[PDB]
Design a protein around this ligand. Structure first.
Ligand SMILES: [Mg+2]
Ligand SMILES: [Mg+2]
Ligand SMILES: [Mg+2]
Ligand SMILES: [Mg+2]
Ligand SMILES: [Mg+2]
Ligand SMILES: [Mg+2]
Ligand SMILES: [Mg+2]
Lengths: 144, 141, 142, 185, 75, 62, 118
RNA sequence: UUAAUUCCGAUAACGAACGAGACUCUGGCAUGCUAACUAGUUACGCGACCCCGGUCGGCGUAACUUCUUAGAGGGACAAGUGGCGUUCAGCCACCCGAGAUUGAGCAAUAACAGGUCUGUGAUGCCCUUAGAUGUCCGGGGCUGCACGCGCGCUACACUGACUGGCUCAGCGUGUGCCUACCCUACGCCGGCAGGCGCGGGUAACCCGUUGAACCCCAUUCGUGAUGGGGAUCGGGGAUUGCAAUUAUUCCCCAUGAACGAGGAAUUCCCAGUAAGUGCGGGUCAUAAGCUUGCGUUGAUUAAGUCCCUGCCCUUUGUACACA
């Protein structure tokens, strides 16, 4: 399969994001902000896809199989502790949160922390370190 | 003529996993395609059949040093925990994959539970590993 | 039948190796494994230096079973090689003619002196004020 | 063979030191034949004992540099082992001999010091030291941030120094060093 | 600033280049094969595997960091 | 201009600002009666052969 | 900048003559296989001799290009002379494999490079 | 002349005292001694596997102390040889050999407005002493953040990263007068941190043959801020704690910043040294980016000088003497 056949695509378009076709698929679908180096491997093992195959080398019949497992992992036997959003503060729903949904959920966590005037929300507003860090000496680029 | 000791262990593990494949009863778990087998890792084991090689390694280590339990296996399959911004340390393997390799390898009668605990190799398990040593020794000719 | 064992030790560092050389056939093996598979294998000919310098017919009448404890892989290999080269040495003082022993010394020492006498270099103690044995911490001014 | 000692797979004979200024400072021949470039050591106990050190032991000793590679003589023995096979394949001739030729061709014969500078000539020992050092860091900055291996860079750098091709860092720093020694004598 | 576009699979304009000249190289390594043919090192290793299986090149030594091949022995 | 070869017959002392050079008497290997003085950089013991790229440049004493 | 560009071009030429030496050596290799398996390939031995002519002159050209690069980094030989001979050396690299070959004998006699020993 | 106010020698000095040296510990060496069921080795018997032999930290007892332990001794003295030397004090090289310069500890006189009243029921004086500067409880701060500096850790990758396999240490510490808090084998549930059960160990006895990391062998990568790097940040899960929010710590997923080897300048170091690499101890309810030890792998260069910064001695000059 080292010959370049038909159906090679240099840039893929899943979850309204690009994919480098040069990469192995197990690191190529990490380009979706929401899917990382290891959630890529668990999705590409729940579907029978050989990991030495490249993103451009894949055909259309299996890229939809990849992103449907991305969209709903609990329907495809992925356990609950891979997910970046379980026990949500609004619907209590276990899900994996993806490309623009990740910015949406991060922003709603931020503003839901802002509205109650929590300390972490106020430090996120002012731009300081929110996890209790010593801001006296380091972090010289978030400030000035 | 040949033992497990007097043959190179590198291909010996790689061929004994194939013997455990040909047995066809090695009892892989349900999460074997999803997990990381140690704390000091960040990526899943790339081999689809890493459980068979791990069982081969465990059988070989039980041959070479018996009386070994789950804490001993996590001591054997330990590595450097890269703590990121902090320096690296020593971390162990996964107790569940260790105990399920042992429970599989006593599900098919190749290891045995020692009195008070620990795992020892059965005599026919020694025979199995020694014939796998014989096959990889005939592979040197 | 005279039992003709000799049991010697050899060192490089905290690793020490005991070679058990007795009357038999041409067997040489360390920790139960033969000498051609002891890790790391880039020092395979380092392990084989007593064998390849002294040939095989000197090894023909004796078998040697070596255990080694302590240290690490390179110090392990040097203690093993030490133990072999002085195991044939202490067998051939004891059981055969002394002049075969003398010409074996004429092979081993004039190749390398660390086959039969260990180097006395051991780890020097770390002292206070520094990260190690001789080095010290960074001195800061102003 | 009991008489001749192969350096793994290279004979230590058929290597002729074309210079006599480095003939008693390049240890290759007739008592210094060893199987490996890994010995125990005690070569820095006295002042001139590193002359007794065989030149491939010194080549592996000077190749373990830049901090992350300190204590890795087994790895540098393996790099030099692969580099010698690449050299023998590229030239059809003895890697030990073109290593000796690279030493002789790269060793800078005169230097400049401060007694505004003043020119001096070099020790045979310092000439061999500077030769090995320039060859090793020519391999190092050939292999840094690059796809090709340190074994390949050491191999082609030794071959380029054995011909004086001015593509080797050792030659193109030797000639400038002798040039600035020429400038202030 | 600087960037290389290394081929990740051979196209037909490079496959003939490989299978024509590369078995005639005195030094054959995936590194130098990448440097001549502007390909990746992984693609070069996958190339030299089938070239060794078809016997157009000859393995001399292998390591996990350095594998070297050459031309066919004459005989 | 031929380059010449010369054997050290004597080491005289360390010279330089930091004492980094040796000052040796060299006897040429063409004429065994021609011995001049050169300052030499590096560890030089007596009995050793040096390649002089300039050979008639005599070195100042100590 | 100009000296660096010219020396870089000389490095590319020693690379391409190394490659073409490898090509002619491998054709010598395979025709030598054929002659040793079946003696009687006199035409193949003659082709080996013609390829050996090509290898010999490519080696000579490598040695003079190496002399040029040495003397150029030592700043002794002038870049105007190297630009005087760059067109003819390019012509050699382009036309060495052709039967129609009109080579300059005076490539390095224009600079007295064969006159000066190594 | 020496590392030395170390000696020879000279001598208005003679005889001495401290420091130096000697000294104690530590390292290296003993197949000679003492001895070993809390250390073993070798034999022999039995068991297991293979094809008479091989392996076995599988089980057991007749010798022995090589390996181990730690005691008594021995050992090395510039002793031997050849030069250099007032043929002195001594220096260089070499033989023989484990060692021909192992590393520390202790460390004189005189001092310094050096630090410590926040080590003390060591302590003078002063302040305060019931609306307390005593003491206790609750909460907060010592972590606060435009900037500057110091000690450090991680890195900027292919001499690498990831993933499998293989294979080796040495110091230790461990169930507590108060005092609760130990080290853990092993069985089972759990991806994981963890949890639920029975056991050993007050320790050469159990953890433990401390299966440590680096290194070594095999995969995937491919010069791309990339699978380098892992900061920042979001969601969830466990442990300790009376209580964790300004996230105690640990995990899981996701986010994937600067950083392409660092200006002027500047630190430490020469043989098991630097450097890499992990493991102990202290701190510790939870606990190492620190420190103190330990090993493991193991060099480049140097056997020199007074150029720089300082130190010692003599002579010399001085308007300096809190110099
Ligand atoms: Mg004061
Ligand atoms: Mg504070
Ligand atoms: Mg990245
Ligand atoms: Mg990373
Ligand atoms: Mg300084
Ligand atoms: Mg502290
Ligand atoms: Mg005056």
């Amino acid at each position: 399969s080292l010959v370049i056949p038909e159906k090679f695509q240099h840039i893929l378009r899943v979850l309204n994001t690009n994919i480098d076709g040069r990469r192995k698929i197990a690191f190529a679908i990490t380009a979706i902000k929401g899917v990382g180096r290891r959630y890529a491997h668990v999705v590409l093992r729940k579907a029978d896809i050989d990991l030495t195959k490249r993103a451009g080398e894949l055909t259309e019949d299996e890229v939809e199989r990849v992103i449907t497992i991305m969209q709903n992992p609990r329907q495809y036997k992925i356990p609950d502790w891979f997910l970046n959003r379980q026990k949500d503060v609004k619907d209590g729903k276990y899900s994996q949160v993806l490309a623009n949904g990740l910015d949406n959920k991060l922003r709603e966590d931020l503003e839901r922390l802002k509205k109650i005037r929590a300390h972490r929300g106020l430090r996120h507003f002012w731009g300081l370190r929110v996890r209790g860090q010593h801001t006296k000496t380091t972090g010289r680029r978030g400030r000035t | 003529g040949v033992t497990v000791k007097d043959v190179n262990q590198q291909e010996f593990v790689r061929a004994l996993a194939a013997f455990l494949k040909k047995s066809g009863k090695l009892k892989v778990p349900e999460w074997v395609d999803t997990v990381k087998l140690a704390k000091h890792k960040e990526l899943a084991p790339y081999d689809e059949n890493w459980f068979y090689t791990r069982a081969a390694s465990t059988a070989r280590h039980l041959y070479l040093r018996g009386g070994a339990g789950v804490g001993s296996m996590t001591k054997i399959y330990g590595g450097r925990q890269r703590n990121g911004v902090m320096p690296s340390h020593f971390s162990r393997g996964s107790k569940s994959v260790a105990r399920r390799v042992l429970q599989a390898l006593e599900g098919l009668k190749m290891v045995e539970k020692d009195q008070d605990g620990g795992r020892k190799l059965t005599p026919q398990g020694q025979r199995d590993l020694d014939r796998i040593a014989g096959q990889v020794a005939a592979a040197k000719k | 039948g005279p039992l003709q064992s000799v049991q010697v030790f050899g060192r490089k560092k905290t690793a020490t190796a005991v070679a058990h050389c007795k009357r038999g056939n041409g067997l040489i093996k360390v920790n139960g494994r033969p000498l051609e598979m002891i890790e790391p294998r880039t020092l395979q000919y380092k392990l084989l230096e007593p064998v390849l310098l002294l040939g095989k017919e000197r090894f023909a009448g004796v078998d040697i079973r070596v255990r080694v404890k302590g240290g690490g892989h390179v110090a392990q290999i040097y203690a093993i090689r030490q133990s072999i080269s002085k195991a044939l040495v202490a067998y051939y003082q004891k059981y055969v003619d002394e002049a075969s022993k003398k010409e074996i010394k004429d092979i081993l020492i004039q190749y390398d002196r660390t086959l039969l006498v260990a180097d006395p270099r051991r780890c020097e103690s770390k002292k206070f004020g520094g990260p190690g044995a001789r080095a010290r911490y960074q001195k800061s001014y102003r | 063979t009991p008489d001749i000692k192969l350096f793994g797979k290279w004979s230590t004979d058929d290597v002729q030191i074309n210079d006599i200024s480095l003939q008693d400072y390049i240890a290759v021949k007739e008592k210094y034949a060893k199987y490996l470039p890994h010995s125990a050591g005690r070569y820095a106990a006295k002042r001139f004992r590193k002359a007794q050190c065989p030149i491939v032991e010194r080549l592996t000793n000077s190749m373990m540099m830049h901090g992350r590679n300190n204590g890795k003589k087994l790895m540098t023995v393996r790099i030099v082992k692969h580099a010698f096979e690449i050299i023998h394949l590229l030239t059809g001739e003895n890697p030990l001999q073109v290593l000796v030729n690279a030493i002789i061709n790269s060793g800078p014969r005169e230097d400049s010091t401060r007694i505004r500078r003043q020119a001096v000539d070099v020790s045979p020992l310092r000439r061999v030291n500077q030769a090995i050092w320039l060859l090793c860091t020519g391999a190092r900055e050939a292999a840094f941030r690059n796809i090709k291996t340190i074994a390949e860079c050491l191999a082609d750098e030794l071959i380029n120094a054995a011909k004086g091709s001015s593509n080797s860092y050792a030659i193109k720093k030797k000639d400038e060093l002798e040039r600035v020694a020429k400038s202030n004598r | 600033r600087d960037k290389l576009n290394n081929l990740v699979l051979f196209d037909k304009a490079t496959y003939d280049k490989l299978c024509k000249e590369v078995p005639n190289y005195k030094l054959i390594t995936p590194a130098v094969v990448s440097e001549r043919l502007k390909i990746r090192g992984s693609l070069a290793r996958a190339a030299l595997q089938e070239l060794l299986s078809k016997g157009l090149i000859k393995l001399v030594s292998k390591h996990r960091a350095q594998v070297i091949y050459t031309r066919n022995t004459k005989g | 201009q031929p380059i010449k070869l010369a054997r050290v017959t004597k080491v005289l002392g360390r010279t330089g600002s930091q004492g980094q050079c040796t000052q040796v008497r060299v006897e040429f290997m063409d004429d065994t009666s021609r011995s001049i003085i050169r300052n030499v950089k590096g560890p030089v013991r007596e009995g050793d052969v040096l390649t002089l790229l300039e050979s008639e440049r005599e070195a100042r004493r100590l | 900048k100009e000296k660096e560009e010219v020396g870089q071009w000389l490095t590319n030429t020693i690379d391409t003559l190394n490659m073409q030496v490898d090509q002619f050596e491998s054709e010598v290799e395979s025709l030598s296989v054929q002659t040793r398996k079946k003696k009687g390939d006199k035409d193949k031995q003659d082709r080996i001799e013609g390829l050996k002519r090509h290898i010999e002159k490519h080696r000579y050209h490598v040695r003079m290009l190496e002399t040029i690069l040495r003397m150029l980094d030592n700043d002794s030989i002038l870049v105007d002379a190297i630009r005087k001979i760059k067109d003819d050396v390019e012509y050699y690299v382009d036309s060495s494999q052709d039967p129609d070959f009109e080579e300059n004998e005076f490539l390095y006699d224009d600079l007295d490079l064969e006159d000066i020993p190594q």
